[PDB]
mmCIF file of C-alpha atoms in Angstrom:
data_model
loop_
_atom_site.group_PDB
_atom_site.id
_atom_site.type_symbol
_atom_site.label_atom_id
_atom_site.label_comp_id
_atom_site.label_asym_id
_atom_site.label_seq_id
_atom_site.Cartn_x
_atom_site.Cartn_y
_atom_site.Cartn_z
ATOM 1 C CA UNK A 1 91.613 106.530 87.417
ATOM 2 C CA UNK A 2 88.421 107.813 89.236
ATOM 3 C CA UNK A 3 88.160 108.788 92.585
ATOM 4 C CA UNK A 4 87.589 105.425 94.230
ATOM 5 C CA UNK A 5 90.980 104.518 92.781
ATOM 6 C CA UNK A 6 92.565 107.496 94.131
ATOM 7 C CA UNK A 7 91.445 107.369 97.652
ATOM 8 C CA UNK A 8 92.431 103.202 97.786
ATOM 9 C CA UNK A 9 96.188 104.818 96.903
ATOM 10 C CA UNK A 10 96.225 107.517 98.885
ATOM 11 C CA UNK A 11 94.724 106.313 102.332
ATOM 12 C CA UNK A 12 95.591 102.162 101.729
ATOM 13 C CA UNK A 13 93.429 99.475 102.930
ATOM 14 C CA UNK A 14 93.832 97.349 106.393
ATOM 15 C CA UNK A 15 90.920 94.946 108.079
ATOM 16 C CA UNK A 16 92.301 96.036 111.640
ATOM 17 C CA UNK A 17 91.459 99.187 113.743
ATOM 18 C CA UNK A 18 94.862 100.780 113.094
ATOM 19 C CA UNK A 19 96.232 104.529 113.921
ATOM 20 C CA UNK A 20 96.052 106.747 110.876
ATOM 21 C CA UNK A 21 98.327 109.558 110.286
ATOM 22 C CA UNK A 22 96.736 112.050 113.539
ATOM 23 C CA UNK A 23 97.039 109.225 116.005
ATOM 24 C CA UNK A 24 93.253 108.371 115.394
ATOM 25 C CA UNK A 25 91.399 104.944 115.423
ATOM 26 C CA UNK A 26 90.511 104.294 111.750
ATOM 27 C CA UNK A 27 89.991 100.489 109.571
ATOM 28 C CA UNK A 28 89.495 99.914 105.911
ATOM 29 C CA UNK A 29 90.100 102.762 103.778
ATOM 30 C CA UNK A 30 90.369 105.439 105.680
ATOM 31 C CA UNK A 31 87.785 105.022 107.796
ATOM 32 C CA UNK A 32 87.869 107.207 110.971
ATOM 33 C CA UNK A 33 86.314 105.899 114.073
ATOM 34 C CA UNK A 34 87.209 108.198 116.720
ATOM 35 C CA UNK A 35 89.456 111.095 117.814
ATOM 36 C CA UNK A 36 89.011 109.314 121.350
ATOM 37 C CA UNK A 37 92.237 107.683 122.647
ATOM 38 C CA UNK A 38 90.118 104.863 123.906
ATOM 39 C CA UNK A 39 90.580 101.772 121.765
ATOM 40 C CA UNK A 40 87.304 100.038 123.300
ATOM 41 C CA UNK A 41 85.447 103.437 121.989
ATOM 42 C CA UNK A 42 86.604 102.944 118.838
ATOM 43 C CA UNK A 43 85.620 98.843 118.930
ATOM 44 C CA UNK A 44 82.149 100.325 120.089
ATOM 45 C CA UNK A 45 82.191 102.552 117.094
ATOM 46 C CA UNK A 46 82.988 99.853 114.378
ATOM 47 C CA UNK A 47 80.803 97.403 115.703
ATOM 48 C CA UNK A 48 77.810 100.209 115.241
ATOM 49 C CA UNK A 49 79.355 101.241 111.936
ATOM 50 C CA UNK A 50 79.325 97.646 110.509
ATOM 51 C CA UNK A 51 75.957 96.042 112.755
ATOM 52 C CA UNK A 52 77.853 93.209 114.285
ATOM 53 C CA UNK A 53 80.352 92.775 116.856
ATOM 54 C CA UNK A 54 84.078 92.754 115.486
ATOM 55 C CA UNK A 55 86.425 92.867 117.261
ATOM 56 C CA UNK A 56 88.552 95.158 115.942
ATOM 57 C CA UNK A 57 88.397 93.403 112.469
ATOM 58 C CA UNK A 58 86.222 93.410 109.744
ATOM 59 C CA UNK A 59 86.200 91.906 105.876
ATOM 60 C CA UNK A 60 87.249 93.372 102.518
ATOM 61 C CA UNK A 61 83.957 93.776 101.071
ATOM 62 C CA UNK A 62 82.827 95.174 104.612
ATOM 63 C CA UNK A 63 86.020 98.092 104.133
ATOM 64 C CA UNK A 64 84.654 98.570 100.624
ATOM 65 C CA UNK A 65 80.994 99.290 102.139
ATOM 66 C CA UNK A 66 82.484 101.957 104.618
ATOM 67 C CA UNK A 67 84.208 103.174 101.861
ATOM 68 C CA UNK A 68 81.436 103.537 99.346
ATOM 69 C CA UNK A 69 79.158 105.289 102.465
ATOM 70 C CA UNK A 70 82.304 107.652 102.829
ATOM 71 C CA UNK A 71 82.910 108.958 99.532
ATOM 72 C CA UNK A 72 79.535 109.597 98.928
ATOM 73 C CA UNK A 73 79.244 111.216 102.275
ATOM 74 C CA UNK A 74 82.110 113.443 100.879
ATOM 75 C CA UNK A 75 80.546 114.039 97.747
ATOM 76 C CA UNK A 76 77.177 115.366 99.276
ATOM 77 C CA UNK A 77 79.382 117.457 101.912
ATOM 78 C CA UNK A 78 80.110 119.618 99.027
ATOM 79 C CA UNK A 79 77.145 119.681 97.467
ATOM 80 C CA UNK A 80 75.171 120.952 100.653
ATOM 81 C CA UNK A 81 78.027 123.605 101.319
ATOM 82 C CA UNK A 82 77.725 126.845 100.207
ATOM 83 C CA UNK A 83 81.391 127.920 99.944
ATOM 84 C CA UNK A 84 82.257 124.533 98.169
ATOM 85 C CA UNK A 85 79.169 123.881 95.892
ATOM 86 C CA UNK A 86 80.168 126.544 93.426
ATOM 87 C CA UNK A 87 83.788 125.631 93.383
ATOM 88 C CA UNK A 88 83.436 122.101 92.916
ATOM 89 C CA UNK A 89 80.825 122.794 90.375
ATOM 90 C CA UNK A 90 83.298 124.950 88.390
ATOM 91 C CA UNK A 91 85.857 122.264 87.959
ATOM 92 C CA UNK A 92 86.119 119.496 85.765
ATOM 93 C CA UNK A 93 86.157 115.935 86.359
ATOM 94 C CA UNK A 94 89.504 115.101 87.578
ATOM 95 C CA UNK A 95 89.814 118.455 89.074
ATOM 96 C CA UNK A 96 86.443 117.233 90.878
ATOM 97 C CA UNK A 97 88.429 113.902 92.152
ATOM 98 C CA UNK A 98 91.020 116.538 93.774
ATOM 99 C CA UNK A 99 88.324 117.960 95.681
ATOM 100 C CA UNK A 100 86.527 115.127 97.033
ATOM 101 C CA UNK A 101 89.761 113.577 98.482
ATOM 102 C CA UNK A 102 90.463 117.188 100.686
ATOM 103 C CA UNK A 103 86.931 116.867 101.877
ATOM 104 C CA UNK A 104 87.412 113.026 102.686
ATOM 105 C CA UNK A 105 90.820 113.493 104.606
ATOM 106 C CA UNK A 106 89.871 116.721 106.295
ATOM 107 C CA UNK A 107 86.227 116.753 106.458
ATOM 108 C CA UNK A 108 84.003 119.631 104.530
ATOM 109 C CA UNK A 109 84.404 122.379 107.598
ATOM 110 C CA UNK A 110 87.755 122.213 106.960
ATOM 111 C CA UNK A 111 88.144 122.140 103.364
ATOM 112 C CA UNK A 112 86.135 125.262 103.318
ATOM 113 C CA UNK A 113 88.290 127.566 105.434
ATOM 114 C CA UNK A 114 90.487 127.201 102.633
ATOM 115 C CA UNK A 115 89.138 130.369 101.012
ATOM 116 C CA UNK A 116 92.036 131.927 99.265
ATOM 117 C CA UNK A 117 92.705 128.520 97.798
ATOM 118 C CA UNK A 118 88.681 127.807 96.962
ATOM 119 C CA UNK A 119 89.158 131.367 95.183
ATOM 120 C CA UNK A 120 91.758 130.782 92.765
ATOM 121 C CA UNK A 121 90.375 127.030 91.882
ATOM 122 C CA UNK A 122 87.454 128.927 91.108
ATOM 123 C CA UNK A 123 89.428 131.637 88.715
ATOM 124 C CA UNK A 124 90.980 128.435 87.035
ATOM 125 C CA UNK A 125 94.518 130.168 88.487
ATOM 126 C CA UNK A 126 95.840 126.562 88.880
ATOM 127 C CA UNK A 127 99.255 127.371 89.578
ATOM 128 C CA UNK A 128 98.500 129.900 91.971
ATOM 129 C CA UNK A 129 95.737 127.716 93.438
ATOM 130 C CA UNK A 130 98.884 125.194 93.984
ATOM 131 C CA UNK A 131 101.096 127.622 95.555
ATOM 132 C CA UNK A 132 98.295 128.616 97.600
ATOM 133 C CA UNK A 133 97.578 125.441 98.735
ATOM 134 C CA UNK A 134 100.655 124.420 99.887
ATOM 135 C CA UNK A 135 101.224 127.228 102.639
ATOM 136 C CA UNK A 136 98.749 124.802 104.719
ATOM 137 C CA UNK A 137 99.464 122.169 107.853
ATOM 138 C CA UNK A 138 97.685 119.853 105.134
ATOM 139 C CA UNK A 139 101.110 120.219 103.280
ATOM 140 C CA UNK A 140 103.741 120.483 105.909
ATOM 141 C CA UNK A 141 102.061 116.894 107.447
ATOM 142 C CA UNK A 142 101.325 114.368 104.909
ATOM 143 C CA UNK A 143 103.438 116.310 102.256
ATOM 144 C CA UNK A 144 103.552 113.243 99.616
ATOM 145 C CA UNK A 145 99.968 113.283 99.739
ATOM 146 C CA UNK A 146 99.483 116.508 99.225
ATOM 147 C CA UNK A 147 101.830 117.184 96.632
ATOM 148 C CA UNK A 148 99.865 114.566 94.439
ATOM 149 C CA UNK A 149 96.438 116.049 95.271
ATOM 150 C CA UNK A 150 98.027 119.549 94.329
ATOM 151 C CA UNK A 151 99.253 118.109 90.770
ATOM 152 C CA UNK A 152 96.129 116.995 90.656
ATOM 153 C CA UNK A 153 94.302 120.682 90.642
ATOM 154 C CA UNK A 154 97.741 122.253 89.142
ATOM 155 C CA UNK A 155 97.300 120.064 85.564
ATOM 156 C CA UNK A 156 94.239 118.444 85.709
ATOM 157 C CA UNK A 157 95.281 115.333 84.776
ATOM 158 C CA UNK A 158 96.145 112.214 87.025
ATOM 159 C CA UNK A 159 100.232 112.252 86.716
ATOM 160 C CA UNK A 160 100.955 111.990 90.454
ATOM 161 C CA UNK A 161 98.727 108.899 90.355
ATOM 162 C CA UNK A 162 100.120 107.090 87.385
ATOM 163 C CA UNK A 163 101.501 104.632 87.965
ATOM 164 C CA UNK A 164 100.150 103.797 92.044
#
């Protein structure tokens, strides 16, 4: 497991703007377009995002592009955050994979309000961390997700992931 496969499990994969779990235009992997409730805003997005005009659809390896941009996008989110930086530097590598898929669902800003939490990941308190983390909207919203991204920073292993 590595991060790419996590993300594919937790967020799925579909070619055609769909509504993810906010109500929000997204395609691909996760890929938001727009909090806008206009679906021809979000067409106008993708066809920027991807350089040609789509109508409303694009191609595997196209989702798998977005995707790539995204995660690394995530990745240097951290890395040019001061609250997170340390944090995510502190953990190790599946730990890591925990963090980047907070940041990708709920966007760096938002990950990073998460203080009490950020402060026991950092003390290696993973159980509190977990407990912690759950007294969140994060939780009480997509709970199955959560609860497997939790595991993930409770144990450091990828149980909640094995097997899909």
């Amino acid at each position: 497991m590595n991060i790419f496969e996590m993300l594919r499990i937790d967020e799925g994969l579909r070619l055609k703007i769909y509504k993810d779990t906010e109500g929000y235009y997204t395609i691909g992997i996760g890929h938001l377009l727009t909090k806008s409730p206009s679906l021809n805003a979000a067409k106008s997005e993708l066809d920027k995002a991807i350089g040609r005009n789509c109508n409303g659809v694009i191609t595997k390896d196209e989702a798998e592009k977005l995707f790539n941009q995204d995660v690394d996008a995530a990745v240097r989110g951290i890395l040019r955050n001061a609250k997170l930086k340390p944090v995510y530097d502190s953990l190790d590598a599946v730990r890591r994979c925990a963090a980047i898929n907070m940041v990708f669902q709920m966007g760096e800003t938002g990950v990073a309000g998460f203080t009490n939490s950020l402060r026991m990941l950092q003390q290696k308190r993973w159980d509190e961390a977990a407990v912690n983390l759950a007294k969140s909207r994060w939780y009480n919203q997509t709970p199955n997700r959560a609860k497997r991204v939790i595991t993930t920073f409770r144990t450091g292993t990828w149980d909640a992931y094995k097997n899909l």
